Design an enzyme around this catalytic site. Sequence first.
Site, PDB file in Angstrom:
ATOM      1  N   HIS A 107      49.825  35.407  37.703  1.00  0.00           N
ATOM      2  CA  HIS A 107      48.468  34.984  38.025  1.00  0.00           C
ATOM      3  C   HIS A 107      47.925  33.948  37.048  1.00  0.00           C
ATOM      4  O   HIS A 107      46.904  33.317  37.345  1.00  0.00           O
ATOM      5  CB  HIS A 107      47.520  36.192  38.058  1.00  0.00           C
ATOM      6  CG  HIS A 107      47.716  37.088  39.241  1.00  0.00           C
ATOM      7  ND1 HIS A 107      47.748  36.615  40.536  1.00  0.00           N
ATOM      8  CD2 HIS A 107      47.877  38.430  39.326  1.00  0.00           C
ATOM      9  CE1 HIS A 107      47.924  37.625  41.368  1.00  0.00           C
ATOM     10  NE2 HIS A 107      48.003  38.736  40.662  1.00  0.00           N
ATOM     11  N   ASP A 164      56.290  40.670  43.964  1.00  0.00           N
ATOM     12  CA  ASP A 164      55.039  41.346  43.652  1.00  0.00           C
ATOM     13  C   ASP A 164      54.133  41.315  44.880  1.00  0.00           C
ATOM     14  O   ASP A 164      54.116  40.331  45.621  1.00  0.00           O
ATOM     15  CB  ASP A 164      54.380  40.641  42.460  1.00  0.00           C
ATOM     16  CG  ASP A 164      53.175  41.384  41.911  1.00  0.00           C
ATOM     17  OD1 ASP A 164      52.131  41.420  42.594  1.00  0.00           O
ATOM     18  OD2 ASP A 164      53.265  41.915  40.781  1.00  0.00           O
ATOM     19  N   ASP A 220      54.561  46.584  42.823  1.00  0.00           N
ATOM     20  CA  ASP A 220      53.348  47.134  43.398  1.00  0.00           C
ATOM     21  C   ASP A 220      53.332  47.076  44.920  1.00  0.00           C
ATOM     22  O   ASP A 220      52.346  47.505  45.527  1.00  0.00           O
ATOM     23  CB  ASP A 220      52.109  46.429  42.823  1.00  0.00           C
ATOM     24  CG  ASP A 220      52.296  44.934  42.664  1.00  0.00           C
ATOM     25  OD1 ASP A 220      53.327  44.401  43.123  1.00  0.00           O
ATOM     26  OD2 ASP A 220      51.406  44.290  42.062  1.00  0.00           O
ATOM     27  N   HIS A 254      51.135  40.886  45.183  1.00  0.00           N
ATOM     28  CA  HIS A 254      50.068  39.900  45.102  1.00  0.00           C
ATOM     29  C   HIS A 254      50.645  38.493  45.046  1.00  0.00           C
ATOM     30  O   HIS A 254      51.752  38.270  44.550  1.00  0.00           O
ATOM     31  CB  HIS A 254      49.181  40.154  43.882  1.00  0.00           C
ATOM     32  CG  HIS A 254      48.553  41.512  43.872  1.00  0.00           C
ATOM     33  ND1 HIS A 254      49.082  42.570  43.168  1.00  0.00           N
ATOM     34  CD2 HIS A 254      47.451  41.989  44.497  1.00  0.00           C
ATOM     35  CE1 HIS A 254      48.329  43.638  43.349  1.00  0.00           C
ATOM     36  NE2 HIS A 254      47.335  43.314  44.156  1.00  0.00           N
TER      37      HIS A 254
HETATM   38  C1  LIG Z   1      42.098  43.624  42.315  1.00  0.00           C
HETATM   39  N1  LIG Z   1      42.130  44.424  41.068  1.00  0.00           N
HETATM   40  C2  LIG Z   1      42.694  43.547  40.018  1.00  0.00           C
HETATM   41  C3  LIG Z   1      44.197  43.369  40.103  1.00  0.00           C
HETATM   42  C4  LIG Z   1      45.089  44.237  40.725  1.00  0.00           C
HETATM   43  C5  LIG Z   1      46.473  44.008  40.756  1.00  0.00           C
HETATM   44  C6  LIG Z   1      47.058  42.890  40.163  1.00  0.00           C
HETATM   45  C7  LIG Z   1      48.587  42.621  40.216  1.00  0.00           C
HETATM   46  O1  LIG Z   1      49.382  43.532  40.189  1.00  0.00           O
HETATM   47  N2  LIG Z   1      49.145  41.273  40.352  1.00  0.00           N
HETATM   48  O2  LIG Z   1      50.464  41.002  40.414  1.00  0.00           O
HETATM   49  C8  LIG Z   1      46.168  41.990  39.523  1.00  0.00           C
HETATM   50  C9  LIG Z   1      44.759  42.228  39.489  1.00  0.00           C
HETATM   51  F1  LIG Z   1      43.942  41.415  38.906  1.00  0.00           F
HETATM   52  C10 LIG Z   1      40.741  44.889  40.702  1.00  0.00           C
HETATM   53  C11 LIG Z   1      40.691  46.350  40.065  1.00  0.00           C
HETATM   54  C12 LIG Z   1      39.233  46.832  39.961  1.00  0.00           C
HETATM   55  C13 LIG Z   1      39.134  48.242  39.350  1.00  0.00           C
HETATM   56  C14 LIG Z   1      39.698  48.222  37.913  1.00  0.00           C
HETATM   57  C15 LIG Z   1      41.148  47.734  37.946  1.00  0.00           C
HETATM   58  C16 LIG Z   1      41.956  48.737  38.766  1.00  0.00           C
HETATM   59  C17 LIG Z   1      41.416  48.777  40.213  1.00  0.00           C
HETATM   60  C18 LIG Z   1      39.942  49.240  40.195  1.00  0.00           C
HETATM   61  C19 LIG Z   1      41.501  47.385  40.880  1.00  0.00           C
HETATM   62  C20 LIG Z   1      41.246  46.338  38.605  1.00  0.00           C
HETATM   63  K   LIG Z   2      54.204  37.756  45.639  1.00  0.00           K
HETATM   64 ZN   LIG Z   3      50.666  42.516  41.696  1.00  0.00          ZN
END
Ligand SMILES: CN(Cc1ccc(C(=O)NO)cc1F)C[C@]12C[C@H]3C[C@H](C[C@H](C3)C1)C2
Ligand SMILES: [K+]
Ligand SMILES: [Zn+2]
Length: 352
Positions: A132, A170, A263, A172
Amino acid sequence: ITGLVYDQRMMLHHNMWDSHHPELPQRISRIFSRHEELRLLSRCHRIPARLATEEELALCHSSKHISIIKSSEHMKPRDLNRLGDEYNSIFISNESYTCALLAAGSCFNSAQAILTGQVRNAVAIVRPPGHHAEKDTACGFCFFNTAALTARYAQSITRESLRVLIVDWDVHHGNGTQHIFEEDDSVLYISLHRYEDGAFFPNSEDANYDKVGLGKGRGYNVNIPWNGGKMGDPEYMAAFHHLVMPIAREFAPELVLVSAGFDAARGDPLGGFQVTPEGYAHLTHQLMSLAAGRVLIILEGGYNLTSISESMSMCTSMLLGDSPPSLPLKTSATVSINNVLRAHAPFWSSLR
Ligand SMILES: CN(Cc1ccc(C(=O)NO)cc1F)C[C@]12C[C@H]3C[C@H](C[C@H](C3)C1)C2
Ligand SMILES: [K+]
Ligand SMILES: [Zn+2]
Ligand code: PRO
Ligand SMILES: [K+]
């Protein structure tokens, strides 16, 4: 020979305000412990971690960004809170900079061990994740773009034209990896990711199938976005059969980097998907048919400690040469695949 890098210093990065944040120090220790329990560790050649240098970070990141993250090492908690809140989904501790340096440097050493014949393939159990992270900013638990840096580092110790394929499975989208290589035909970025019409993190239409690259990079950005469905092994197997492997074989990579988030695994509290450890084993086994088998598997996300430990261990089992284990698509998955065919058939003859 399979290489393996794990350095327990990367456990130091932590969220001092919310100890239940899922990007846990135990993500990497649990994966490593599972490799011991499965007796996979002793079958690997251990590769040492190291710090990336500031000039190595400059392969992908701005001087300003590097300096800002470096400044956090001695910040008081009140200032770590302020700095982290300036980004999308970032927490910082004094150790975060060191750990991010170690994650990139670990993969550099692994890419080098591969490209110098020391090992055939390798696995990197690293954190914090990277895909990211953008040239000029941190984002989504990521400070520096480990996979993107490793691709540019691999080019720097061989030749600039080194064809590097980054498969990002991943759950995302790797927005940083896409943007870094968006105009580059030397690095092919293929991402599979839950999309949900922009509702899934990182919430950008940059992740849609129609973003194919820019300029000379046109055709070298492959987004495979999932919508409306709990995708699993059949959908990922199908995306590999119809899209990932035909494009990759036509690209003929000389090094495969897997942005190997886990994930999308069954049980992940953030992904909601159901890819099985056997499914990840089959995707790895298919990628090993590329680039004379030199695949570097880089941990990204993945937050179910049991699921990521089983899943990444299965990938190492495949890299070690073990036999792949025994294994209708969701309707929207066919729509997704047909979308990517429409966007990319003018660039890849293997799609017709
Ligand atoms: C969308 N989330 C962030 C997030 C998720 C996964 C990845 C990843 O794995 N990328 O490869 C990267 C990220 F920025 C938010 C949130 C809000 C709250 C506190 C934390 C745990 C949960 C409830 C979701 C963060
Ligand atoms: K991906
Ligand atoms: Zn991810
Ligand atoms: O001094 C230390 O321990 C860390 C290592 C990277 C830079 N600072
Ligand atoms: K590209």
